[PDB]
Amino acid sequence: GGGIGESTGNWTCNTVWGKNSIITNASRHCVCLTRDLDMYKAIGNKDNGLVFGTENKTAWVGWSTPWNYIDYNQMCVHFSPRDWQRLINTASKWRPRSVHIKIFNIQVIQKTTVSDGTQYSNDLTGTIQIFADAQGRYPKLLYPCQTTMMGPFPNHIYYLPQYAYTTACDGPTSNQDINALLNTNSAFYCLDESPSAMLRTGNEWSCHYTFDDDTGWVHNTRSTIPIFERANPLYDTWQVDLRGNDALRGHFSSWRQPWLPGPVINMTDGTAAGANLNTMPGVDVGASYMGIVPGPPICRAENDKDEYLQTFWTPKTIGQNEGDVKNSQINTSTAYKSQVPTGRLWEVNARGQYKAASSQGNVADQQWAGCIPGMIWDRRPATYFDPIWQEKPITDDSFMYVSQMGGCTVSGAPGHIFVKNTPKPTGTANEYVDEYSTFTITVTMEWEYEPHSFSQWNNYKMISNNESSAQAYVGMCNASGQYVLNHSAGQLPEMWITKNLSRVN
Amino acid sequence: GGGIGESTGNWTCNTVWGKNSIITNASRHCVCLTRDLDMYKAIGNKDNGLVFGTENKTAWVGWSTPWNYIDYNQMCVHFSPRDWQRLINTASKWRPRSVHIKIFNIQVIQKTTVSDGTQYSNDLTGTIQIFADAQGRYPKLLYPCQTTMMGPFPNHIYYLPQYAYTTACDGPTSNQDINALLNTNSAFYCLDESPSAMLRTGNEWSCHYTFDDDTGWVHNTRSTIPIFERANPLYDTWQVDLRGNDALRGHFSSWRQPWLPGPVINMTDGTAAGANLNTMPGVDVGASYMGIVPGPPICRAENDKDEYLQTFWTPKTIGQNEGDVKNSQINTSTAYKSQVPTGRLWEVNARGQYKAASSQGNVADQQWAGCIPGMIWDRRPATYFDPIWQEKPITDDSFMYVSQMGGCTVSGAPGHIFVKNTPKPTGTANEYVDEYSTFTITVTMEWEYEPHSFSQWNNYKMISNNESSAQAYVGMCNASGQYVLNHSAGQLPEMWITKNLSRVN
Amino acid sequence: GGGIGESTGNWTCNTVWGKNSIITNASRHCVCLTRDLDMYKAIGNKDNGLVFGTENKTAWVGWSTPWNYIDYNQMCVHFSPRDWQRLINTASKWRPRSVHIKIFNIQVIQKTTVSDGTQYSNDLTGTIQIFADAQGRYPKLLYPCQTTMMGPFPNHIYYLPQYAYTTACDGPTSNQDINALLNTNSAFYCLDESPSAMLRTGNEWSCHYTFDDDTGWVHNTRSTIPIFERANPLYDTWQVDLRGNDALRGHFSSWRQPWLPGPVINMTDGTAAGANLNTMPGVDVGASYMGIVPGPPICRAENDKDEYLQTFWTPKTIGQNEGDVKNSQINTSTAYKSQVPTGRLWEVNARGQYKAASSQGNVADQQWAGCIPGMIWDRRPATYFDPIWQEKPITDDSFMYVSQMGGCTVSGAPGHIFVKNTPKPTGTANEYVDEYSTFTITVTMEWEYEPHSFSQWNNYKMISNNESSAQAYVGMCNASGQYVLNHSAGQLPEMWITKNLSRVN
């Protein structure tokens, strides 16, 4: 009952499967580090070069808070390779339902510097402060899959990332610092003001978040039938062809259709070193450019096209106890460049940019083909590494919001849970007792999935492991103890991709 | 109780503020004028020149009815400069809830012509007819902000505008009158058939209209965070850049995004005198061209661009008792040309037209960028002069309807209230007792607004008056008794613009 | 019951006396005139000369509203010469308790211009708007005794004065109009917005106002005993004299006192034509000077000193039906200059400015002697022409507020009652049916007075009429029908002055 000697919680990483629900528990050992001597620091990049290949080319401004926060949003955190596979094979679609988070077994550790080395001792009376931003008072970090994430493997040690945000930024002018970027719209947030539980070793903390019924689904189903061949093949139609003429038997493409595939925006890949951002498809927003790559999903037969396919880095191996990743770029040699192939969009999605009449009875490739009524398409295939949910920035209006990168749409998402070491001052100016805290977090997510059944007589496709992945230690720990997960660059292995199960219609 | 000696209503122009609701009362003294000797008159413009700079260049046909109608739809009518400011500072968003309208203290005045001048006497037994088109039997005039509007200032005398409408119009052919424009689709409406209360001096009239819960909101919130910088700045992401490469720290523009800004249609401004309408962006509809200017809102740093920003005239001063405005063009020298700047869209809206891959690894400016899934944008900033609600013409299908001009979407709007002087004939052919009626209208609108609170630690922006506006008599009556309201041409003063309050996310 | 044929109220001007209460009814026939074509007009004086003898030498800015208001605040309105005398003789002190106001028998009269002359006809359906500013929403005109007042005599016809106010004024700069005077603090008030009863001939209007128990008293008592001789004359005192020495018998002035008289500010009178305002005692406030004349009351034997005694104009005669007085200066030859003698302060108030030690055992005249603890004084004698109550401008702090001019202090005063003719438009721009309204107002004020009894054996002083006043038609109507009231310039007749009755201690 709060004594330093009884444990405040238990470690559970097991997944329980219901008929249409999954409960996944992610328990991690988390290291909370004092951030910037417990100081909010104004941070920004004045330079607004907007050129590819160079860091700090986008002007931005904001504050790094002393607080650390929990980022569990990704699929690989909550699903083992085994459970993900079951999910891929078993469910047409799934969505998160609730997330329960426990923080317990809190240890504030004092680091003491001695000649031999650092000495670690428990600070029994030391507290950590924890508050959950249910209200959305503080800026949400909505960008998916940063290094802020928990490890996929239970045994990985999690260092809560330092909470920082960007605020309203002016277009930079010459010979001026970051403050110049700040304006009357710019917002400084002091997390410290918010009521936050102060926790000692005896204490436990939990919050609960429930997703609204309007939460988006992640779809594992692929169409069996081509959308352009929906006809009975044995019968002619009264309908004319595209050109206006008789619709010949077995020439469904020529025939007019009651529907069309989703919108296609022409996309390009640029290899020019230090090219201007506006070289790539996108648009200027504020003082900085925003790109639309990859854009609306289109089926691409080709294995390696950056613009068309979802592309992201995956760790080659994942070390069990990596240091705090604040301000550290992922090493290129430590990551695979993985592209998610859209060949699973073969039945529904358009392969290439649309041709429409340009002039004089000619059709031109459509650089931007927006949504027109009667358009039907499938989403980009989701992946294991994709966020669970994607929260779009609040705006007046959005159109059929889907993240190309991944995640399922949510009217609202779990608010950030902020954890910070309570500063223990030494009684001397600018000096604090050097302390970090370790605790165990348990993220328990309830899931909903729709079971998928096959009505086709013939054998159907299941996703199975392969020898090359096993011999790559995929979903295993290698000889060095590192957790491999994705084993290869290029086309992301079929295991981690959704849109597998076969829907009839 | 109906006697000519007791008043049938009271004058209230006060605004009452609830926690989340506002009740605004607009009381005006209205002059009802006999229209065209109580005759429905076929009116049309045969010429369909479709060229800028010349009146009657659009072919149209319809009828001017003897009836007059109430047009209270605009914000400046129902909100004083003081109340509008409170609304701008206090509320994130607002919408109309109900509108109650009273017509009372009716005076039918006989005008008698004598050598000295016109003599005015009360016609005690004279009636006015009033009916409200709740059913939508008669054509709705949906076009926002015509000279039909009530004055913003309570003391202004309101002359009900003559009700006229356009109907189905044929493309005009040479050597033919307006009748030729009429076709089998053309609709003549006789208001007189509808049951209408006949009212004497003793009588009072009221209707009530309640907006559906589906009514659109007018949004006063501005995003603090750039939508392209939503990431934690201190952390790298697993995500690749736009080009497919490593996403550098502090170069958010290069990074791929889980969302994109709203659609951008390239817009142009033409200064060519008497230029063809098709010169401007738009499309042909029926026999006449329809333009899409300003189009989807985009952030424009520049103060004066007609196509990009909402542009409308505001009165320089507003006289207290202007004559009936039927068939009178607003004098150019009596109006300011006001453009609503979109610089408040800096965080969310795209600054310029999108670039998408054209060919050979090149990106071209997109003349039309339609909505594609995952697009998020903010509406054009609303203004004090904007209509309260905008009712779109009935059609089978509409897409995310928003008026660039202004107003909030309504599944239905208050039906027109038609008021006409009952004709008093002299017993001689084509001769009527010359009479107008004055009455007091009270438009009581219940409003809903969402209170806005700031969670940012630092000081936030409020909209305040400035010396230049005060010294322009803004929201005041000048030395001549005229009510100034908007004091300057060009960029419309920040007071009258919405999207002020700061939303966190 | 609201018909044009039954009267809506009765005329009562009688005063009813209770044991300690007086009810006074002031009924007047009021003419309500259309003001400035029903237009709020910005009005100001840019010139800030601040020199005596010239009009518009004080910079000010504000608006004249279309509204007219009721000003009944003065004693001569509510008390006949007979009742005032009874009050002066009977009561030590009095204060207003409640005020009830009826407006009834409303006639809207249309003025028609014909060759013979103006023709007057009743506009039966015409309304007047009346609202009482209980809330204090609109600026209070607190300045006592303007030409806005009702006549003292019941038969006088009252024209409601046009409501105008001054607002925050900037210090004027060269080559600029009144608008320049306006600033961000300046306040424009639209009376029209406020809910106001619209009244026809049948209608009656009433409000009630109750004074708080904290309302100030007007004091009719004079001290019999000199405050400096409070001792038993037959006995020596242990107390030393002022100089520190033995206090001789019958030399009370030499003796030290347990109290001192009220504060004395040296005052001067300047006869210099066009002298700077700062010549007179006072202080600069805002961009304009404010004078402190007459200042704290001091007893002055002399009959004619402007600075020391309350000085104001009284009408020589008062015509029964004077025209509207808006913007008309009182004619000098039509007024008596009346000074209220302070010789009644003989027992208590200090005759002249205090001497205090300057240096080297010398005493100098004190130009400003402020309040010091132990100071006791009597107020300046109140008069018949003095306001009933004086409302000071709202401020954070006030010190023992008393108006030298007159009136009794009130935490709050009856809010202005605004009456305006509802504009009747002709249907033509800037043209209204020419109309004024006449109605009968009844101001019923309940008073509280403390009965005064004499305990002195010998005969006491009563205030009686004199032959010279009777032969001046004082409190009478003269041969021409004019109501004389004050009959002489100089020392105001003893009849109209308070501080008569003799208090023992």
Place this chain on the structure above:
Amino acid sequence: GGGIGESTGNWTCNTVWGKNSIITNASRHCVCLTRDLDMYKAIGNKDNGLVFGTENKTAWVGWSTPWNYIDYNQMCVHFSPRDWQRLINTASKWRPRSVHIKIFNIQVIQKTTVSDGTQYSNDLTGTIQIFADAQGRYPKLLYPCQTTMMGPFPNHIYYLPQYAYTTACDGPTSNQDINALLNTNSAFYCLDESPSAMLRTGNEWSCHYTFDDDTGWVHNTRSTIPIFERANPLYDTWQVDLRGNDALRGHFSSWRQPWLPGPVINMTDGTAAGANLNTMPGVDVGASYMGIVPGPPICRAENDKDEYLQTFWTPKTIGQNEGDVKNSQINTSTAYKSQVPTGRLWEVNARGQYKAASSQGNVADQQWAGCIPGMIWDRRPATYFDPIWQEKPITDDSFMYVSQMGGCTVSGAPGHIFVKNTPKPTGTANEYVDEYSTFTITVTMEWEYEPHSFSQWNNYKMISNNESSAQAYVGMCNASGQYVLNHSAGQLPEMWITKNLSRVN
């Protein structure tokens, strides 16, 4: 339940706003330092030079106690820049209602000296003693805004200031120590005698203080109307001018007034280095001079006058964890000299010292103009940095007590809360285990404010942030983590000043 492992309280810094009440929570991490080896020490300054520019020029004597105390009295501690702004815009006036104080999460830390450096370890059984002086047994430190204050920013670490006081002091004589200053009136207070809770890590401490209904208000309202122009501008008055003559239209300054502005004491600024204190306006008290600067508030157009305007230092930046400030003068280069402009007193307060009749019909400037009856004035504008309440020293009599420096009057204020580390002796003479304690304090203050509404039709003034303040990190933490708050010397930014909202009358 008291174990070292469960936390004894939570951190809340949030502000909750009621309709007319505000609850502000100030939570700080406090460092309690052993003071002077737990010894009461007689402290005094024998020198009584009474000359400007040199420290210890005022003779004083007293004791520094081993105890530390809580000083939370200032506005910036309890209101974030955001909440202060809301308060400034929203409320006419406000006052503190209750203050609740929690002290919890107490850590006694032993400091151990080792060759490497100081080693910090928790002393589990160590106590701190806390007692609140509700009774007023010990001297109150009433002087506003010393370095004893908590930080305005939640994350700032608070070091409780050592409690010391001054007692009755004799005028010093040559060749004598501080003891000579002590006399029979001098009072030594031993805090140790008072019952005080001894607290270990498990323990929590709280007190509650409720302000009496007689507590003073801080006023945010400014008069719109000049007090010298309170008249209806369109009407002449019966009242004479200041000089005794006809009161001209639009020359309100010339007119006599029913009230006068508050008292003005002539004030001067002296630049003479090492000038005698008596050079400045003030008076001798005891053996030391007391100055009256700034004195009664007067409106000053000029931006920089020390005597007339409230003047105080504000930190340029505020470091998060400054060392104990006992006996440390604020560095001049670390502070802004801020003067609070009185230009907001334009409507009510007198601009300059009063002129009153000197002699021979001449008026002289009044060096001291004390309160005379009928004087009305506004207080000096309050500021964000001003104390919450100001407690005057107990005396027999006070007159309309207001602190020019700031704060609201209180019949009584929260008694000092004294916290001291329980001395842990080593068993050796004059040797104690070196220990300090850190704890978290929460100051929860309930506030009352009167909501302010505008009745003026035109736009009104709100206080908004400006770009220069944002680009100064006002209300933000700068790049170095320091909390800027006031960003400029000279005129204190309009954000932090009260008397904003516009009262009608």
